[PDB]
Amino acid sequence: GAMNSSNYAELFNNDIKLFVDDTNVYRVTVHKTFEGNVATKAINGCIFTLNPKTGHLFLKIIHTSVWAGQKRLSQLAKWKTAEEVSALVRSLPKEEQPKQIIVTRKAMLDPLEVHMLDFPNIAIRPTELRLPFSAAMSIDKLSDVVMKATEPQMVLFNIYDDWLDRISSYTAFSRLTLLLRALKTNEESAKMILLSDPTITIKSYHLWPSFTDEQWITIESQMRDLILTEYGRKYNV
C-alpha cells in the first residue's frame, strides 16, 4: 500500500526497504536551433536509490549515451530506471535484498513491477509523501560525480555521513529531507546557510559539513525559516 504520514515510522523498522527516485534520470537543457526551432540536449543523469534506515545511497549514473538513437526518452527513462533497480537487487546478496521498494513517482510502478517479476515477494509501493529527492543534484559531490562520468557508473555513498553515530534513522531522515527541501525551494540560500562559516568543513568522505550537535540545531532552524519564508513569497500569505 501507499506510504503516507500514518505509516511513516515503518521506514525505520528492520525490514530492508529502498526509496527509488527517477526525477534526475533523464535531464535536458532546452535551446534554440539555427533555424530557430527548439531542441534538447541531454546531460548525465542518476537514479537516486536510498535505504532510509541505513543511509546507503546507490547512485546509478545514467550516461547520455543511453539515449542515443532512442525515442520517447521520458518514457524510456522510467523503464531504464526499473531495469537498473532490478539489476541492483539481483546484484545484492539475498539477505541484503529489500522487502519493499517505494517509488517516489507513481508512474514508476508498472515499469518496476514488470522488471521485478522475478521477485514476487518484493513489494513495489507508491507514496503520498512529497519527498524532495529531486534536489539530490544540489548536493555538490553528487552533481559533480554525475556530471564528470564518462560511462555508466554506480557510485555508493552514505547520505547521512556519520550522523547515525549520534542520532536515530528517524531523525537522520528528517534532517536529510529538511536539508533537501530547503535546497529545492531556494538552492542559493540553502547552500549559503550550509557554508557561511569557512571553519566548518566537509570531510573528504562526507557530503555535508561536520557540524557539532549545537551547530546542527542552528542549521536546522535556519533551514526551517528558509522554507517558511519561501512559502509566504510563493502564495502571498
Binding site: 524510456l76 526499473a82 508498472d110 515499469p111 513491477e113 514488470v114 517479476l117 522475478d118
Partner: protein
C-alpha cells in the same frame, strides 16, 4: 428444428432462451420451447419471480442429445436433464405440441443476431470452461467465480477461462520487458493464439462466451474475461487483418445486443476508451466505435 420440453412450471419464473424470454406464472401449463434452430449453441436461463438474485441457465446443443427441463423442489431450481430413451422423448414432444403447450423459438428470419453472437462458440469448448463431464450441457449462474478470481475457492464450480494477466512472466519476455508490456503482440500471437488457443476462432469463441455469460447472468468474472481478451488484441500492434475485421463485427453485435440500462457495470470505461481511442487498434473498430458513440456517449 428441435425441442426442449419442460415437465412442469411449478414456480413463477422468467424463462429466457438465447436473447428471448417469457414470463411464466406459478403452475401455468408451460411445457417447453420448440422450433429451436439447429446449428448453433443455445442457452436456456431462469430468474425466479421471488429471487431476482441468481440468474442461472444451461448452455446446450440439440445435436448432442435430447434435453428437457424439470423443476426440482429439493434444490429449488429448474434442472436440465438428458432423456436417453429417444422414442420416449419424441413421444413427450409430440404430445405437448399436439396439445400446443409449447412456445416457438421466435426467430425473425432477417435476424442474424444469435448467429453473430455465437459464431465461434462451440459446445466442446464450453464444456472445458465449465467442466462437468457427466452432462452434455453446461450450468452457469450469476455467482460462479473464475479460476483467476479464485487464485486471488470451490473448483468444481469454477469458470476455467484462460488466465490472462498483463504483468506476469507469461506475458513478458525477459529482456523485452518494456517492449512486451507496451506492445502485447508477443503475448497475443505466440503465447495465446499459437500457444494456447491454437487459432483465433477458439479465442473469439471464449471471448464471445465470456460476453454472453456476463450479459445473461451478470457474471462479473465473465465480464472481466471479455474485457481482458479485447484489451489483449487492442494492445497488440501486430494483429492478423482477418482478426481485426472480425473483432469489429463481434463487438458490434455484442454492444448492439446489450440491455441499454446495464452499460454501467458490463462496460469497463478504461478498457473501451483505451481500445477505441488510445490503443494500436483505435482505427480498426469503425463499426464498434460508431455504435458505442451513438448509444453510450456518456461512458466515453
Amino acid at each position: 428444428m428441435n425441442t426442449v420440453p419442460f415437465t412442469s412450471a411449478p414456480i413463477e419464473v422468467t424463462i429466457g432462451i438465447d436473447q428471448y424470454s417469457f414470463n411464466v406464472k406459478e403452475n401455468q401449463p408451460f411445457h417447453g420451447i420448440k422450433d429451436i434452430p439447429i446449428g448453433h449453441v443455445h442457452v436456456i436461463h431462469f430468474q425466479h419471480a421471488d429471487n431476482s438474485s441468481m440468474r442461472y441457465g444451461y448452455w446446450f446443443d440439440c445435436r448432442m442429445g435430447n434435453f428437457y427441463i424439470q423443476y426440482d423442489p429439493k434444490d429449488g431450481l429448474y434442472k436440465m436433464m438428458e432423456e436417453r430413451d429417444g422414442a420416449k422423448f419424441e413421444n413427450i414432444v409430440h404430445n405437448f405440441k399436439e396439445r400446443q403447450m409449447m412456445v416457438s423459438y421466435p426467430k425473425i428470419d432477417e435476424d442474424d443476431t444469435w448467429y453473430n453472437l455465437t459464431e465461434f462458440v462451440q459446445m466442446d469448448k464450453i464444456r472445458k470452461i465449465v467442466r462437468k463431464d457427466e452432462n452434455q450441457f453446461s450450468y452457469v449462474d450469476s455467482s460462479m467465480t473464475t479460476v483467476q478470481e479464485n487464485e486471488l475457492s470451490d473448483p468444481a464450480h469454477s469458470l476455467n477461462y484462460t488466465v490472462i494477466n498483463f504483468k506476469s512472466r507469461e506475458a513478458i519476455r525477459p529482456g523485452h520487458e518494456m517492449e512486451d508490456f507496451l506492445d502485447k503482440s508477443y503475448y497475443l500471437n505466440t503465447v495465446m493464439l499459437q500457444g494456447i488457443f491454437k487459432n483465433s476462432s477458439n479465442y473469439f469463441g471464449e471471448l464471445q462466451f465470456a460476453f454472453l455469460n456476463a450479459m445473461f447472468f451478470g457474471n462479473y468474472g465473465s465480464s472481466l474475461q471479455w474485457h481482458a481478451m479485447i484489451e489483449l488484441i487492442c494492445s497488440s500492434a501486430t494483429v492478423p487483418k482477418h482478426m481485426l475485421d472480425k473483432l469489429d463485427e463481434i463487438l458490434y453485435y455484442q454492444i448492439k445486443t446489450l440491455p441499454e440500462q446495464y452499460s454501467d457495470i458490463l462496460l469497463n470505461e478504461r478498457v473501451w476508451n483505451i481500445c477505441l481511442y488510445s490503443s494500436f487498434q483505435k482505427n480498426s473498430l469503425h463499426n464498434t466505435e460508431k455504435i458505442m458513440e451513438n448509444k453510450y456517449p456518456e461512458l466515453l
